[PDB]
Amino acid sequence: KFPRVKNWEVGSITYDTLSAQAQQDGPCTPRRCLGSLVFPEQLLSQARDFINQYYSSIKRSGSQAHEQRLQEVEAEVAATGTYQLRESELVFGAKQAWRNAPRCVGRIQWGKLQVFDARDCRSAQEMFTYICNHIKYATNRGNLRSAITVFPQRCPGRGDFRIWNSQLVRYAGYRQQDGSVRGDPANVEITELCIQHGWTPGNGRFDVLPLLLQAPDEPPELFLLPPELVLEVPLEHPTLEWFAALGLRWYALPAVSNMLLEIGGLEFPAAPFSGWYMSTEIGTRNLCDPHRYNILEDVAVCMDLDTRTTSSLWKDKAAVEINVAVLHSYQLAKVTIVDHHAATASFMKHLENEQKARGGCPADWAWIVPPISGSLTPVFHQEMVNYFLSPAFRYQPDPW
Amino acid sequence: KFPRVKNWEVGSITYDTLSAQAQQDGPCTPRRCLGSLVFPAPEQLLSQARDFINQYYSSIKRSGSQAHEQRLQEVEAEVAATGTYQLRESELVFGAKQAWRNAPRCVGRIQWGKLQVFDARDCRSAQEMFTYICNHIKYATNRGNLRSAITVFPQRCPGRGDFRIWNSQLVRYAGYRQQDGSVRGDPANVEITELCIQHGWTPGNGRFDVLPLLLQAPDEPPELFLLPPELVLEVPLEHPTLEWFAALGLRWYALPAVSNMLLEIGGLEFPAAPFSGWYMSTEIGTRNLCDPHRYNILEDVAVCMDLDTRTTSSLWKDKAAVEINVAVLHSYQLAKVTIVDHHAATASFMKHLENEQKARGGCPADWAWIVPPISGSLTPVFHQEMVNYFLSPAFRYQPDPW
Ligand code: HEM
Ligand code: HEM
Ligand SMILES: Cc1cc(N)nc(COc2cc(CCN3CCC(F)(F)CC3)cc(F)c2F)c1
Ligand SMILES: Cc1cc(N)nc(COc2cc(CCN3CCC(F)(F)CC3)cc(F)c2F)c1
Ligand SMILES: C[C@H](O)[C@H](O)[C@H]1CNc2nc(N)[nH]c(=O)c2N1
Ligand SMILES: C[C@H](O)[C@H](O)[C@H]1CNc2nc(N)[nH]c(=O)c2N1
Ligand SMILES: [Ca+2]
Ligand SMILES: [Cl-]
Ligand SMILES: [Cl-]
Ligand SMILES: [Gd]
Ligand SMILES: [Gd]
Ligand SMILES: [Zn+2]
Structure with missing residues (x-):
């Protein structure tokens, strides 16, 4: 019941007891393993369990404020069908969602993250200002600092905040009459949208695209990034x-801008995050x-x-x-x-820290091992267990 | 639906229908993936045997024929009288090739149809076992122009021990536990080295000393055999x-030359069946x-x-x-x-995946083992999504015999 996990360079054995708390279901079955695929009102119950995590996390479980927050969220959903996170709960959910990301090798940093609360946002012109704050803060003239900005949660009946670009900074991808691409081939689709919603195409290999920001129930708007802002x-x-x-x-x-952040049953379809x-x-x-x-x-x-x-x-x-x-x-x-x-040496340290903090650590070997010199890094020789804990970042359908 | 599989270098999409035919279960659940772990009865014999016979008769495009009906009936009667059965020689050649074809962690499976099968099922002692192996080494080495080969020793049967080859590979360098705690030689081979000494091998002290073979005939302690230096290129x-x-x-x-896996064909098990490539x-x-x-x-x-x-x-x-x-x-x-x-190697494996898709509608592959240990994303298999699962016939790990 508890997976035996071995390190083949060292010979050390641990057991992953945290995989028991796997809240969702991955793609694999006893018949076939699919780990190599890139994409493979009772809302109260998620909301309840995240609060328990939170108060357990601050050593205030079953205590005073614990039972009050519980009846708080109950009342909020009873009155409206959704509920609001405290700013601190939001900070904690943000860091945990990073901490639980199986495919991120940078998680040694998970405690240091700057959470920017932008849930009071409306209109894309305000999105754009929130985003430029983020970009200026995180860049910091080259001394990089991790950060996330959280836009308003999805709620029933209402539109949605979406950033159409997959990252905040992306080079254009132009198609030519010989079928090929000038610029970044990964961006041929977002580039034609940018042109189609207004943008004037450059013609170089490293033309920075504009931002296609979308506020609830309006078409997206172009926003050009100031060149002194994009280092x-x-x-x-x-x-x-x-x-x-x-x-x-x-x-x-x-700075990844198209992943959906999920906290205690709530879903934030625009919450861009950046590291180095x-x-x-x-x-x-x-x-x-x-x-x-x-x-x-x-x-x-x-x-x-x-x-x-x-x-x-x-x-x-x-x-x-x-x-x-x-x-x-x-x-x-x-x-x-x-x-x-x-980086891989620090992920080893993170695995050891998490083995003592929570008994294990969800990790996706294929994404942890670097794409050159695999076996020259210590994680190549580390067996790993991949599962889904919540809170979490998830992929989401394109906004079209 | 079946698992949708994507190649990210090309954009192309396939569906792995073959995985639906997976018999034995793997280590993963919807709760947790263990794909990265290295090592995670009459009526079931007949159903495996039946399925194998059907495979053979599909291979030669004679499904449903009279010979197909008769061989099934033939296998059924032998299992009912003896509790086991014997492969025809042609079934054994086909079975060994299929096991290679089915091996998810092998990147050289483009070659799976060109495999020399030595039938040693009439082997009766450790000395005859050693002779079969020297002939294997000689054939496959071929003075440097290597040829793929497998030698199948007698199958496991009740009331008699197994043939086993204690060494994990036919050719390995000694690893001597040094006195200060270190190792002179290959550290992976410290255990088998100490077993050779204890069984009477006088050791050397180089970094590249070829270990002797420990061969086990049924119900007998292992016997020590020195490889002739001219055989070990x-x-x-x-x-x-x-x-x-x-x-x-x-x-x-x-x-x-891997010598410690078990080969399984139509429910029958071959505990000693060393195979080699390049x-x-x-x-x-x-x-x-x-x-x-x-x-x-x-x-x-x-x-x-x-x-x-x-x-x-x-x-x-x-x-x-x-x-x-x-x-x-x-x-x-x-x-x-x-x-x-x-x-x-990885470019030829991509060609193999495309043949297998056409031939069987899929191909079991273990991504972490197919992607080479340097320059991963520079090879094309890095960008190929893969589905891992168990088909039979198959090469399998088995406990160490000591
Ligand atoms: C600070 C230094 C960081 C480094 C060096 C780093 C490194 C990486 C790498 C190499 C990947 C694999 C992505 C790929 O190659 O496609 C990844 C994925 C990921 N990272 Fe981190 N990262 C960092 C910060 C962060 C932060 C601040 C967050 C969120 C708060 C985060 C969340 C994620 C997520 C959700 C993924 C999965 C995305 C995917 O599946 O493609 N990372 N990271
Ligand atoms: C002909 C050239 C061949 C090449 C280039 C080749 C290559 C490889 C490689 C690179 C691996 C991964 C092994 C490791 O990293 O330790 C592997 C595994 C494997 N090969 Fe092949 N191989 C060849 C022939 C064969 C043959 C002839 C057989 C059987 C008849 C075979 C059966 C296997 C099996 C069962 C494994 C998996 C063993 C395990 O699970 O540890 N291979 N091969
Ligand atoms: C904060 C941070 C730091 C860092 N150092 N690196 C990252 C990269 O994070 C991602 C990287 C990728 C690229 C991989 N690939 C792109 C095309 C595809 F979407 F089709 C499939 C995934 C996709 C994501 F969603 C990501 F969050 C993020
Ligand atoms: C026929 C053939 C050709 C080729 N070119 N190469 C191979 C390598 O096949 C294996 C190689 C090894 C040794 C490497 N190592 C041993 C310890 C470990 F089990 F942890 C992981 C693998 C073990 C196996 F079982 C193998 F099939 C075999
Ligand atoms: C097909 C395969 O799953 C895909 O190429 C994965 C493998 N490992 C990866 N690892 C990282 N870090 N980033 C990736 O995009 C991928 N891609
Ligand atoms: C822990 C990890 O699975 C282990 O080191 C694996 C990774 N992939 C591998 N892939 C191949 N081909 N051979 C190996 O020995 C390994 N080792
Ligand atoms: Ca033309
Ligand atoms: Cl990138
Ligand atoms: Cl080897
Ligand atoms: Gd030059
Ligand atoms: Gd030189
Ligand atoms: Zn799996």
């Missing part, structure tokens, strides 16, 4: 002088994936590698140097970044 | 442009030489490369690991020993 890093290499001339750049702040980057996210996935910028062969040609036989490992050598360029360029510009060795 | 490691690398004095063996270079380069709990040479190579090992942000570990993998591929190709790099 970017020109990519250069410590020793390959031609690398800079490739013209590659990326942005400082990874792991270097492999930029250098390996964003620039070297075949369906993203796909620059691997360009760099290999420039390094004078032999590209007509797979066994010279030219793909591997070019990838490492692109990651070195990324790390060097962010450091040179004093923008917070973390390499996959340091 | 080994490759000295050198680097194409790092001339000091040869001074490390690194070697690895040509032939990867290496993927990351198994030697990354895992066997750079795992911290294996030969753990990564820091030493990095210093000799004059890399800045005092901070992770220079990516010295990645750089050294690449050159170790370069050395392995260069050294095998120089010695004329078959080897495949992880880009070629």
